[PDB]
Each structure stands twice: as C-alpha cells, then as structure tokens.
Structure 1
Amino acid sequence: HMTPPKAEKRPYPITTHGDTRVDDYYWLRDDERTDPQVLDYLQAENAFTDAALKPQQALRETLYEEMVARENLYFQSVPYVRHGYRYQTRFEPGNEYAIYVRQPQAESEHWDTLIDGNQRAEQREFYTLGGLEVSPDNQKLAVAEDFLSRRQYDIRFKNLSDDSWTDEVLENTSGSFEWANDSATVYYVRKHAKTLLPYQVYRHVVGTDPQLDELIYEEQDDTFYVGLEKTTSDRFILIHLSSTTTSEILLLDADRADSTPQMFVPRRKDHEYGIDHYHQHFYIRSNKDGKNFGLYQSEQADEAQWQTLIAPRIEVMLEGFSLFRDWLVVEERSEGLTQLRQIHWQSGEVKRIAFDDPTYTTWLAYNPEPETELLRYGYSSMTTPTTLYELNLDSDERVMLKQQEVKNFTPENYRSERVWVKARDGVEVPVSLVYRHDSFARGTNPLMVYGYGSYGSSMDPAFSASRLSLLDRGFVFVLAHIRGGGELGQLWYEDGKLFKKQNTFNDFIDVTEALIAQGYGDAKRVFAMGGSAGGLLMGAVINQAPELFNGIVAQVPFVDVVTTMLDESIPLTTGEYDEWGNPNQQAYYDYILQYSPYDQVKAQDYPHMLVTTGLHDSQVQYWEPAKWVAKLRELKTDDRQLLLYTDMDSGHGGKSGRFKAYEDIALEYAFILALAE
C-alpha cells in the first residue's frame, strides 16, 4: 500500500588497504544531531512506522495491560543489615521513584527515611540514583544522583543527625565512591570532561570546598576503566583499573591519613585479576595460569607468593567468590550450568548447592557482612520466577526470603528443555527453551529465537513475566547460547570474537535449523530478536540465511561495523579492538568486512523486520540502523515489512522508565504476533 521514505543517496567513498567501499548514506551521521535533512529522514521513517503499525493498536493495548497486570504495585526489597542498621527499599503505587529507609538492627517498629527519590526529583526534568552509602560511623549519607540524564553523577552528603545537607557537590563523577574508616573522607572517580571516561581518583573531606580535594591517581590509558572497591576487611580501598583484557589494582590504606596508592601487581597484557582482603590475607581471582581462572591466597602483592586455592580447570569457569567466617563460596560455570560451591577454610569440606531444573541460573546475591554462616544467593529458571534464598552454610538449611510475584500465572502450565545442537564444525551448542504445554503440537508452534553472543556475556536461562505474553499465544521461546557468549566459559567467548566472530552467527543458524528439524516449531513461523551486539547477530544472520526467518526485531543494532571500527572519533571504537579487531589491519578489515551487515546487504529477499534506535544518547550511534534501513529499502527484492522506530525523547523515567519499557515490548510483540497470526 504505502510508499516508504527514500533517503537521498550521496556517494561517499572510503578506501582502506586499496579497497573502495561507496557508502550512499554516510551523511545520516550528524554528531551534532541538528542536520535538518537527517532529522527529516528519521521523523519520516517514524511516521511510516506509526502508519504501518496503526492496525495493531488494539493488540498493543491488550499486551501492555496484561504485562502491567502481572506485576505488583507495592515492591519492598528484602531487608539487609550493614554496620548495625537494617535497610529496605520501598516503591508505593503513584510514587514514580524508590524510597530508601532504615532502622537500628535491634529496632522493629519505626523506620527513618534516608532518601525519598520523589522529593529529590521535585522540579527536575530527570532523576537517577546512581549510589547510596552511609559512612561507617552511621552519621553521614553519601548519594550519587544524575539530574541531567548523561550518567555524570553529582555526589552530595547528608547529616543524618538533623537531616541537613552539606553545602558542597562533587561534580562529573562515575558515581563510584568509598568511605575511609574515619567517616570524614571519601574517595571518588572523576570522568574526563570530554570523553566522559572515568580517569581520575580524588580524596574529599566531607563539608569542605571540593577545590581543596587532592588528586590521588590519574589513569594514562583510556581503555582502562577506573573503579573503586572496599575490601571485606575494611582495611583497603581498591583503585580497580581494567581493559577488556588486562587488570591492575592499587591499594589505599582505609585507616590512616595521607594514604598514597600502593601497587598490587603491575598490568601485564591478557592477565585479568581481582582481589579482596580478609583474615590478614589477600584473595585473588586470576587467569595468570589458565583462561578459566584460578583462586589464590597471599600475604603480600608479589605474584610469586600467591598460593593456589583453586587451580584453573578447562571444564569449570571460575566467575567470582565471597568470603565468610568459616567458608569460601565460589560461583562457577560447568557443562552449561551456573553453580555455587562452598569450601571450609579449616576442614576443606566441599559442598555443591543442588537444584532440579534443566534451564536455571544461580548467583551470589548481596552479602555485606562476612561474620555469618548465612549465604544469600539468587535463583531463576524459565519456569520459576526469580527467588532469593538464605542457606545455612554449616547446616544446609535453605529458606526462601523472597519470590518474584507474577499474577495470572500458573507455573505448571509451562515446560522447559535444555537441548544441545551439534554445530556445523561438530562443536556442541546448548539451547534453553520454554513453551505452554496445552497449546504445544510438534511442527506447529511459532519460534522466537533470542541471542546476544558478544563480550563473554551469557544469556543465562531465567524467568521473564513479559515472555508469558508470547508463551500464552502458542510461542516456543528459545535462548541460543551461541559462541561469543560466556555460557561454556572463556573458551566459548574467545571462539566467537576477533578471527572467530563468524562462529556466533553460524551457531544461531545451526541451532534454529536443528530446532525446526526436531519439530520444536513451524518452519514458516520462525522469528528472532537481538539487541546492540545482538543486533549485529540479527544483521549478519539475515544477510547469510535470509530464508530461515519469517520476521526479525533488531534493537539498537551494531551493523556499520567496518566504518565505525575505522573511526576513533566514535565513542567505544578504541575499547572494542579487542572484541571485533582493528580494521586498520588488513587481516581484520577482510575478516570483519565478510560479516559487517551494512556492507553485506544484497539484492535478495529479506524477512519482515522492525529496527529500533535512539537519537539523543547512543550505545550504537543512531545513524547505523538508519543507514542500514535506507540501504535495505534500496536493494531488497521482497515486498515484506521493513520499519525503523527512532526514540526522539529527551531521556528516561523512574530509573528505567518502566511504563515506556513495557510500551516498547508491546510494540515489538504486536509486530511479531501480527506476522505469526
């Protein structure tokens, strides 16, 4: 019916290694975001998306309403104790933001407000609480707040005794700060006013002019993120320096005045380590001897002195640890499962935390105090809503502290399976899927196949209440644990990045083909979704295997890969040479160009597709998906739906603009449900 927008073509040649690529839409990039022709094209496509999806308004309403009616209005966090006070977070209906309260641990009846997000947001356009921590003496509250939506945080201090605010503000910070043990001094991280990269650590005396703050440390390499931590012992504040590949920690004595940074272990390429300090020892998680990491104990910094507690193992990835009075507890991955193990400091007794679910995730939750036998850990499966447990590490007593509440939900209505697919190279790829039992008939059901598959991030199988809107309409929902993710440890990550990145896209296709072959879904109604680096996935897969999918949602997709990775002026490019590679090298130019979705768009039939992006703020810059859609409209040979939806907004809402997140999910789900009908 309707004529889609047609972007003007302006042939823009880019020549590298004597290869000339001609980019007809280079001009959709305006770093200033004011070119009126660039805004006209984005607004035109939004108007086309509006007009094309107008008939789905009723369905979007039904979806929105049933998603919001699943979740409670009142949320109360599980209370935790820290330094003799009990803390709870509270959301009332009508209140846009959290209220943070506390009481003395020995107290039940009365709670004091620490901070009311609604009060703090009064007469502001935007509010996000980035951080909240009371000093060790329980007398002062430090808060990191963002009033301007650019994740530059202001730090302010409140005297809890008389609820009065101090006069000063620490400006343009990462929101990362730590109290010295004097409850008078804080360390905090200043962003580079230009790059916005966290680069400087300062010491501040609370009450005083931030002019008098002392520069403690400045990071020289802008691939190294600067973070602050405080050891379980409270003896050290950690300056945590990391690239994607490489760590370095500096120690600040948290007890004494005029501390300067003390090197732990100098940075060495491809050595990642993190430390804690407890019971007069350093504990270190390090890949020095093995990609899957080991855990070491040491009296001092010197790497030569580190004693092996847990050796690196090819079949077990060591993800993190917590330290308690009598136990070490570690989070690991093995055979495609997250796992928790406990080891007694004295007896060396080992226990495994057991579950009975094919598709679940477990993790260490918040454990602020080490002098206890009570471990808090989280659990979620494709069929069991997210649960906090408290485990007695000595007695094995396991009590539920909180369950995610889901209305109109009967858990036994759904089934889940773990499936292993032999990929085209003989490698075994795990898959997690879930469906409604009473509407399942082999070879009949639409499939929704979700992937990410970059940075070693895992799509761990867990519960989603919004997913019930697809399951209750006959969909089989699949997580494809493709290479480039972390589900089978560091090797699974490395086998889907740099000169192996193609395995990511091949795994997604291999999984989809197998699931259809084995009768999990209807071959004519296979859908897929992926966002950001998962949008790169969507883009490569439709160029390579266009006929496999009926319809796609590609959120904020990374698709202009070669051109973006050739340009250091784009934020992220300098940090990502260790992910995709550096196309200033001909080997990486050729390898990346082979899959770069914008470059590999051809005159062939594509699936129906909804593409999303955002003008004002960017992980992926808005222009990549805009150029992608313009080029697809120019070359694609089919007559299927292609829509571009650009968020024009100023910024977000109550933390994650929850209203609006559900509206976006409803629009994407109506689009897929309309195609599956």
Structure 2
Amino acid sequence: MTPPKAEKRPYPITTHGDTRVDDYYWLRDDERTDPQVLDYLQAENAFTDAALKPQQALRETLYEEMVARENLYFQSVPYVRHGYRYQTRFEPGNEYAIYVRQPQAESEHWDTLIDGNQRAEQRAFYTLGGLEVSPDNQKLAVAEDFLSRRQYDIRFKNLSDDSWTDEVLENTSGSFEWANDSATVYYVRKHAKTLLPYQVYRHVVGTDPQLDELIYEEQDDTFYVGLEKTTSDRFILIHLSSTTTSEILLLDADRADSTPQMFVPRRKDHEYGIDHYHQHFYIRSNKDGKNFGLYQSEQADEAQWQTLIAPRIEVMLEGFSLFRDWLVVEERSEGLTQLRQIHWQSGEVKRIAFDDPTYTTWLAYNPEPETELLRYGYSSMTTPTTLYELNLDSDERVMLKQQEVKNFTPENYRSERVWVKARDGVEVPVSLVYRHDSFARGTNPLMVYGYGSYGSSMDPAFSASRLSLLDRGFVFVLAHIRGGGELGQLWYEDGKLFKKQNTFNDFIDVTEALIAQGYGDAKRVFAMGGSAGGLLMGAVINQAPELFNGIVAQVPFVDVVTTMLDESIPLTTGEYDEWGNPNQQAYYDYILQYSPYDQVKAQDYPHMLVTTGLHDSQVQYWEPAKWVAKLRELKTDDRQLLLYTDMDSGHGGKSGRFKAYEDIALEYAFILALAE
C-alpha cells in the first residue's frame, strides 16, 4: 500500500544566518480553504481508514466497553452558593446539559436555570463558556458560543419570569464578574485580530453595549487578562498573568465608579495571586522562593506582607482555601500532592493521610467560607475519582460522590510509585498500573504516557478508558518527566527553555529502566502524548526510535521553530517564556536541536498514529501534516505511519462526548493490533 506523497514546494526560512528549507510550508492555510491542502489531508485520512480497516471489530468492542461503564444518566455533585443549591443534569437522548438550582432549604422542587438543548435549538454549535447568578439571585449572566470559534456572547436572564434582557455582549472570553449592586458586570474582551484577552469593559445590565466604558487596556502582549472576585465579595480583581510575571488591579465591587487600584506593580519573575477575607489580603507569592509562600497584609504594599507560610526547597505551595476557623492549603512534596489545615487562632495543624502509592488529592469547590466543611477531591490508578466532605473540627469524612465505573472490580489491578535515577543523577518519579492476573515480569506490553510542559503535572488519577488496555496484559505508566510540576517549580524550570532536553531524556530513561527492571516486554514498548506531549513524542522517536514499537502523537507541536518565529499564529506570544524566542541566536539554536520537524533524519522509526483536528484551529493542523510528509520521504522503515485528521467542527470532550470515545478506541485498537 503506497502512502500519499505530498507535493514538495521548497520554501527557505533563513533566520539569524543559517537557512532551513521547508518543502511542505504550503500545507498551512489559515482559512482551511486550499483544495490542494484539503486533498493531502483527505488522502492521508483515506489511507489511514484503509490500513486500520480490519481493526473495526476491535474498535467497536473497545467503544462499547468504554461506553457501557459510563452512566448516560449523569447528575453532578450539588454545591451551595448564595443560598441556592446548584446541580448539572445530563440525561440520555439529549446532547447538552440542563443546569438546575433550588433554595438551599428546599428538597422537592428544582428550577431550570438554563437548558443547553433549548438554547441549542435551531443552532449548529453550542458551548457554555460561563454561567453565574447575580448576588441578589434575581439575574443570570451566561456566556455562550453559538458559532464555536472560542469567542462567547454574554446574555442576562431574569429568573422571576425567565425573561431575557435586550442587549448581548459580544466577542468576550466568557470571563465576567457581577458587582454587588447585581446590575453591573465587568467582562473580558478579546482583540479583533490577535483574539487574546487584553481588554476589560464595564457593562450596566440593561444599558447600551456601546456605552460600556473601557476600564483597563492590557498593553503588554505576553499578559493574559482575567477576572476573579474575592471571598469577601469586596474587590473584583483584574488578574494580569504571564508565565513568569503577574499583576493585580482591584475594582471596588460596592461602588459604581471604581477605577483599577494598583495592588503591587509587576516585576519580572514575581508571580502573585490574591484573595481578601477577615478584612485582610491573603497572597500566594514567589518573592522569597520558587516553591511559593503564603503571606498576609492589611493593604497592598509589599513591605507590609507578613509571612504565614515561608517558601521551602522541599514543599511546593500550589493553592489555598479560606474558612471561618481554618486555612487549608494545596502542597506537593516527594512527588505526592497533600493537604494541610491550619487554625487561624490556635495554630493547630492536621495532615490528611492516604495509603495509596499513586494517588492525587486536591481542593475542590468551596464557595462559602463560613463553614467547617471542607470539600476536596481524590483519585488514584486503582480508585475512581472521589469527592469527600471533611469536617475540619471533628475529622469526620463523608464521601459525596464517586466516579461511576461498571464492569470494574478494583482488586484486579496493582499500582506502584517507582523512582528512576536519570542519566544526570536526578530521581524521576513514575506512577504505573497493571492487572494482577495478566502480569508476568518481561512479557507484558508497556504503554508510557507523558506531558512535561508548562509545569503541568500528570498526577496519577483514575481512567475508565484505560481499563480496556489493562484487561489485555498492558502496564500503563505515567512518567513525571521534568517540564511538569510534580516535584515543584524547580522540576518545571529544569524542563523548559534551555533545559527542555531533560523532558525527553527523562522519558527515555524511565522506559529503559522499566524494561531493564522487567515491568514490560522490550519488543512491545509503546508511547503516547498530546499537544506538548506530542512534542515529547516527536523528539523521543527522532533520538530513540529503537525503544518503542508503536506511538500515538495527539495534535503534536512538532514544528517548534517555524511556529514560534511566526507571530501571526496565536498562543505564540505567551509561549516565549516556555520554549524561547528564536529571534535570539541563543534560543533558535537550542529549540531547533530538539524541534521534531527540523530533526527528522533518514532512519528507522516506530509504528505511528498521528492525530489532528482541522477546524479546531488551535491545534495547528499543518504541523502534524508537514511532519508526516517529511517522515514519509525520509524514513527508511516498512512500519506504518498514519495521519487521521478530524474534519468536524462542533463539540470536543463533552455533549458530543462519543467522538472522544471513538478517537480512543481508534488509538487503543491501533496499539493493541501492533501488540497482538
């Protein structure tokens, strides 16, 4: 079977001095119009369809496995907020959810806030970006996208008679906050071209959208604009944030005249985020360390910040929650997430204990501070995702809801925390899981997942889909490679920019170790990763093709240099502090040397499935497309290279959820076939 050969159109870049010829630069089209591009993608999709056609039997098997353990009757965990209990209801034969609420003192009746299906009537796309009731519980602001271009139209509704307002606020990010008069909101506007949150406008609910005065214009290109509100309900915060630096202006939520009040001016490498409660500010700042500390102050002035939790080399401070008698904080240490409660008055401390070798715990939704009930999540590789409600005074823990998993008995699966000494001497943590009865050291197929970017952690949690693999001899693995945030800020900074090469080394080292230690079969080694995890993939294969038999590169970021050079591509402006700006010989040199597209050599590669989305936009469909074209011309091997490009538009990971389960069946079948 001859794979599709793309038309070679030489296009030289030439930056700083050295020239890169890109044969497949023409594959980029920002409108998705070009028939000649469409053809290559259709051709490549058609080839994929043909190669994977005998696996249909398995795909359907896996699809129904993964669907028949998920209740189509899905209610949420109800939360109280402003005296009303709020729940989301999914029911079969209905694509979008129904959001309901009831008086906190009420049981019998439930009121419909917004029905997605009703709003979806007569429209081609629907995605709910935001939904929040005004402080007085009379009005309902909602951020909806009826065109699905990641750009939301805010509308207001009166819950008394379910009547809507005249006006509609357009071109927003969906991020808004009510003022305490319940007739005035601030909202974040994107630019007409760049389409990145940079403007904050004040609207008076029921007035003209033209007469919505601009409040703040964020000039610095690298700074994302956001809107939070404090626990005190006193200040609406304008949270400016780049990847290293941050700034916070305050808006008086009680006065209808309030200009942004400078909290603490932005300083390079000082990331801070605030809250307000008990007539105090509570700040999480990295001014005295990478790992962050919690600080208290009467006013904004940085000098006046008292230290509550000083930064440490060994414990990352991730987040916090305020309550009447207790402070509760999110922390990591030794590759485990953990929680702590600290009494404001007494100073008493209580850790929350857990046996599991590979688990994740986190702070859940706690909107009302005046309670002794903490709400925190938990998940592991053997235990479904679970929400608990702990009484901070009595230590009594009640489980509010589990993840519902049918045809699943937990005792069938073993999990392990394995450390691996990397080439440079650094201990890299690993969270693996396998089926008890299928295991036999050195025979089992091995799937190594990894991300390792932005300081994002691949914390060991539960996966219902993963059971399809485990129940076929597989040992699924999470590699907590540098670039993620599993071992704190240091772990991220040691896996980005000039130390990005550590990410890929860490991945290869973990896989080799696990093979050497007999966790998996050395012939049937497989890997997988998405977006920045697809960058991981594209590099790993270039440098260590021998290791893996098969690969799944999801929506991969493989054309690193060219993409980061070209400003017109969105996301690029914020990612300068991640990979680097190749408008510097320094970063150009380093980035290029791992950049998977620039590093495609004429050698053997593993079996590979590259996936992408055309009309999703923020995937960059061409990066994988070009990458395959080049892999096809250069690779020396007989093994299969397939490119599936999604040609849809609507939905994503919910409502049109089943598309997401089709894609995983496609990929799992692919791997399973190779692993036979």
2-structure distance, mates of 1:502, 1:517: 22
Contact 1:285 1:295 in 2 (8 A): yes
Contact conserved, 2:605 with 2:639, CA < 8 A, in 1?
A: yes
**Contact 1:129–1:655, Cα closer than 8 Å, also in 2:** no
Query: In the alignment, what sits opposite 2:397?
Result: 398
- Separation in 2 of the partners of 1:24 and 1:539? 18
1:505 equivalent in structure 2: 504
2: CA distance between counterparts of 1:651 and 1:160? 29
Higher mean C-alpha deviation, range 108-117 or range 464-473: 108-117
- The whole-number CA distance in structure 2 between the counterparts of 1:441 and 1:89 is 44
Residue deviations 1:143-202 (CA, integer Å, cap 9, x gap): 111111111111111111111111110001010111111111111111111111111111
How far, CA to CA, are the matches of 1:210 and 1:565 in structure 2? 36
Cα offset for 1:344? 0.3
Q: Tell me by how many angstroms 1:653 deviates.
A: 6.0
Q: Distance in 2 between matches of 1:584 and 1:653?
A: 35
CA distance in 1, matches of 2:652, 2:569: 27
Q: 1:654 to 1:522 in 2, by over 3 A?
A: closer
SS of 2:598's equivalent in the other structure is: helix
| 8 Å contact kept, 2:361–2:377 | yes
Question: 2:239 and 2:603 mapped to 1: Cα distance?
Answer: 49
Q: Is the 8 A contact 1:127 1:654 kept in 2?
A: no
Greater CA deviation, 365-374 or 192-201? 192-201
**CA offset digits 1:465-511 (Å, max 9, x no partner):** 00000000110000000000000000000001111000000000000
Q: How big is the shift at 1:31?
A: 2.1
Q: Deviations over 1:31-52 (max 9, x none)?
A: 2322221111111000100111
1:654–1:591 distance in 2 versus 1, CA, 3 Å: closer
> Deviation of residue 575 (structure 1)?
1.4
- The answer to whether the 8 Å contact 2:27/2:37 transfers is yes
Q: What's the CA shift string for 1:213-254, capped at 9, x where partnerless?
A: 121111101211110011000011101100111110011111
| Cα offsets for 1:277-303 (capped at 9, x unmatched) | 000000000001100000000000000
1:635-663 C-alpha deviation (Å, 9 max, x unpaired): 11110000011111122268452010000
The aligned residue for residue 542 of structure 1 is 541
**Structure 1 match to 2:222:** 223
Q: Residue 631 of structure 2 corresponds to which residue in structure 1?
A: 632
The range that moved more, 426-435 or 593-602, is 593-602
Deviation at 1:24, TM superposition (A): 1.2
Sort the Cα spacing of 1:653 and 1:363 in 2 relative to 1 into closer, same or farther, 3 A.
closer
Give the distance between the partners of 1:101 and 1:628, measured in 2 at CA: 47
Cα shift readout 1:613-643 (whole Å, capped 9, x = no counterpart): 1111333411111111001110111100000
Give the Cα–Cα distance (whole angstroms) in 1 for the partners of residues 653 and 432 of structure 2: 32
> Which 10-residue stretch deviates more, 552-561 or 570-579?
570-579
1:18-167 matched pairs, under 5 angstroms:
18-167=17-166
Kept after mapping to 2: 8 A contact 1:127/1:655: no
Cα offset for 1:86? Answer: 1.1
Residue 17 of structure 1 and its aligned partner are, at CA, apart by 2.5
Q: What displacement does 1:26 show?
A: 1.2
The answer on whether the counterparts of 2:421 and 2:428 sit within 8 Å (CA) in structure 1 is yes
Conserved 8 A contact 1:127-1:653: no
In 2 relative to 1, CA 301–450 (structure 1 residues): closer, same or farther, beyond 3 Å?
Answer: same
| Cα distance in 2 for residues equivalent to 1:57 and 1:250 | 55
CA contact (8 A) 1:297 1:309 kept: yes
> Aligned pair 1:648/2:627, yes or no?
no
Contact 1:128 1:654 in 2 (8 A): no
Q: How far off its partner does 1:512 sit?
A: 0.2
Structure 1 window deviating more from structure 2 (633-642 vs 25-34): it is: 25-34
Partner of 1:528: 527
User: Judging changes above 3 Å, is the alpha-carbon distance between structure 1 residues 116 and 656 closer, same or farther for their aligned structure 2 residues?
Assistant: closer
The CA distance in 2 between the partners of 1:186 and 1:620, in whole Å, is 32
1:322-381 residue CA offsets vs partner (Å, 9 max, x unmatched): 000000000001000011101000011111111110000000000010000000000000
What do residues 104-146 of structure 1 show as CA deviations (whole Å, max 9, x unaligned)? 1111111111111110100010111111111111111111111
Structure 2 Cα separation of the partners of residues 211 and 573 of structure 1: 31
Q: Aligned to 1:10, what secondary structure does the other structure show?
A: coil
Bigger drift between 251-260 and 438-447 goes to: 251-260
Verify the 8 A CA contact 2:69 2:405 in the aligned structure 1. yes
Matches within 5 A, 1:71-470: 71-470=70-469
- Contact (CA 8 Å) 1:144, 1:175: kept in 2 or not? yes
Q: Is the 8 A contact 2:653 2:660 kept in 1?
A: no
Higher mean C-alpha deviation, range 491-500 or range 187-196: 187-196
Greater Cα offset, 506-515 or 22-31: 22-31
Task: Write the distance in 1 (CA, Å) between the matches of 2:131 and 2:202.
Answer: 18
8 Å Cα contact 2:100/2:112 also seen in 1: yes
Identity rate, percent: 100
Paired residues of 2:95 and 2:655 also in contact (CA < 8 A)? no
Question: Cα distance, 1:568 vs. partner?
Answer: 1.1
Alpha-carbon distance in 2 for matches of 1:583, 1:113: 52
RMSD: 0.9
User: Alpha-carbon deviation of 1:92?
Assistant: 1.0
SS at match of 1:12: coil
Residue 464 of structure 1 and its aligned partner are, at CA, apart by 0.2
Question: Would the aligned equivalents of 2:616 and 2:649 in 1 still touch at CA under 8 Å?
Answer: no
* Mapped contact 1:126–1:653 kept (Cα < 8 A): no
Instruction: Indicate conservation of the 8 Å contact 1:338/1:361, yes or no.
Output: yes
Q: Please report how far the alpha carbon of residue 16 of structure 1 lies from its aligned counterpart in structure 2 after TM superposition.
A: 1.9
- For residues 113 and 607 of structure 1, the distance between their equivalents in structure 2, rounded to whole angstroms, comes to 52
Mapped contact 1:130–1:145 kept (Cα < 8 A): yes
Does the 8 A contact of 1:251 with 1:262 survive in 2? Answer: yes
Report the more deviating stretch, 327-336 or 572-581.
572-581
TM-score by length of 2: 0.99
1:133 counterpart SS class:
strand
Cα distance in 1, alignment partners of residues 654 and 667 from structure 2:
22
Contact 2:96/2:655 (CA < 8 Å) preserved in 1?
no
The answer as to whether partners of 1:97 and 1:654 remain within 8 angstroms in 2 is no
SS at match of 2:40: helix
Structure 1: state its 5+ residue gaps: none
- Shift of the 656–555 alpha-carbon distance from structure 1 to 2, 3 Å rule, reads farther
Deviates more, 1:199-208 or 1:516-525: 199-208
What is the distance in 2 between the residues matched to 1:583 and 1:80? Answer: 47
Pair 1:184–1:230, CA change in 2 (3 A): same
Give structure 2 stretches of 5+ with no counterpart: none
Q: Which moved more, 1:148-157 or 1:619-628?
A: 619-628
For 1:611 and 1:287, how far apart are their aligned partners in 2? 39
Distance verdict in 2 for CA 1:646–1:417, change over 3 Å: same
CA distance in structure 1 between the aligned counterparts of 2:380 and 2:53, rounded to whole angstroms: 35
Provide the rounded CA distance (Å) in 1 between the counterparts of 2:376 and 2:85.
19
Give a deviation string over 1:581-635, Cα, whole Å, max 9, x none. 1112112111111111111111111000000111113334111111110011101
Aligned partners of 2:529, 2:10: CA distance in 1, in Å?
A: 30
Asked if the contact 2:413/2:434 (under 8 Å) is kept, the reply is: yes
Q: Cα–Cα, structure 1 residues 103 and 53, in superposed 2: closer, same or farther, change >3 Å?
A: same
Does the aligned pair in 2 maintain the 1:274–1:286 contact within 8 Å? yes
CA deviation digits over 1:384-404, x for unaligned, max 9? 000000000011101100011
Q: 1:211 deviation in Å?
A: 1.6
In 2, Cα distance between equivalents of 1:360 and 1:655: 25
Verify the 8 A CA contact 1:128 1:655 in the aligned structure 2.
Answer: no
C-alpha distance in structure 1 between counterparts of 2:101 and 2:582, whole Å: 53
